[PDB]
């Protein structure tokens, strides 16, 4: 007896005092103080203020700099577009609802805001996967006479959209569902309530396997090889101070990308799993917010790592930001 159920929701607070209300109808100020709703709003404001420029700039700069429009870059643009689905679909909606203390757009809105927020986060997720595959293919050259070209870059992108629909679409049609999470001001996949009529049980397994484990293995293998290949080359060419530099830079970047990926998705996977294997336990609203703070913040830090720390994009940005010059 841990929260309060209704048709399309689960409030993380006991209704023994009779106070719990539908998070689609009235403020949840018994889950958390109003000032904490305001801080939730402050955080979405920060994520918009940083995330929209960074990710918008990335697209804009691509329009202005011919040199950025290569095929290896398409998946990076795809990332920024996904970050923007999270900014406009998620963060802005949540700012709004946080400041009412509840999910004012009701169940339909809850599906929308959940679908678009989840799609974005997943396209970003798979974009980070597809990137590592493409790099591995290009650098470890696991196939002779293969040249990475536009037509491939396009499949790479489309594959991110297919996989992301494979996660976000089903809860619109019976396999899992969208409901308000945490402070009930935003909506995501129901991965914590066992809800037999939608088979949450098995969805969360499908998610855990297909959308965390596969990604994690593909990223680790691809970049493990990359680091192997480059360390090999440099050992076999110690007369090139450049090549030694390259090896170091590549390796630091891999550690960053790998740690970054974990910071973003490990908490959601950690929590899903702890809950799945501690089904008789009580998880409050702020604890269900932690996984989300990590994932959503990636709409800022991923493009810092993948775009701003890429020498080409960076110079183009600085040029475009200095009116034409530098």
């Amino acid at each position: 007896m841990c929260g309060t159920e209704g048709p399309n929701f689960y409030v993380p607070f006991s209704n023994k005092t009779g106070v719990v209300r539908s998070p689609f109808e009235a403020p949840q100020y018994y889950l958390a103080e109003p000032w904490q709703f305001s801080m939730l709003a402050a955080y979405m404001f920060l994520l918009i203020m940083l995330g929209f420029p960074i990710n918008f700039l990335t697209l804009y700069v691509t329009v202005q700099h011919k040199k950025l429009r290569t095929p290896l870059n398409y998946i990076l643009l795809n990332l920024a577009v996904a970050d923007l689905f999270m900014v406009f679909g998620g963060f802005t909606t949540i700012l709004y609802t946080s400041l009412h203390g509840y999910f004012v757009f009701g169940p339909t809105g809850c599906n929308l805001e959940g679908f678009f927020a989840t799609l974005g986060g997943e396209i970003a997720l798979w974009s980070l996967v597809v990137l590592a595959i493409e790099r591995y293919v290009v650098v470890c050259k696991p196939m002779s006479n293969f040249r990475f070209g536009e037509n491939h870059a396009i499949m790479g992108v489309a594959f991110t959209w297919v996989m992301a629909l494979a996660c976000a679409a089903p809860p619109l049609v019976g396999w899992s569902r969208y409901i308000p999470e945490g402070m009930q001001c935003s909506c995501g996949i129901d991965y914590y309530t066992p809800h037999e009529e939608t088979n949450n049980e098995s969805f969360v397994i499908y998610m855990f396997v297909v959308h965390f484990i596969i990604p994690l293995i593909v990223i680790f293998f691809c970049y493990g090889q990359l680091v192997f290949t480059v360390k090999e080359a440099a050992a076999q060419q110690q007369e090139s101070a450049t090549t030694q530099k390259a090896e170091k830079e590549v390796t630091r970047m891999v550690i960053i990308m790998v740690i970054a990926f974990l910071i973003c998705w490990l908490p959601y996977a950690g929590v899903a799993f702890y809950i799945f294997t501690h089904q008789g336990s009580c998880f409050g609203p702020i604890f269900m917010t932690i996984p989300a703070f990590f994932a959503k913040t990636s709409a800022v830090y991923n493009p810092v790592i993948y775009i701003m720390m890429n020498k080409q994009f960076r110079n183009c940005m600085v040029t475009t930001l200095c009116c034409g010059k530098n």
Binding site: E134, V139, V230, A246, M253, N310
Partner: peptide, 11 residues
């Protein structure tokens, strides 16, 4: 192999 590192945004 640095050509491919440059291409891929890693060097």
């Amino acid at each position: 192999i640095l050509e491919n590192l440059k291409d891929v945004g890693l060097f």
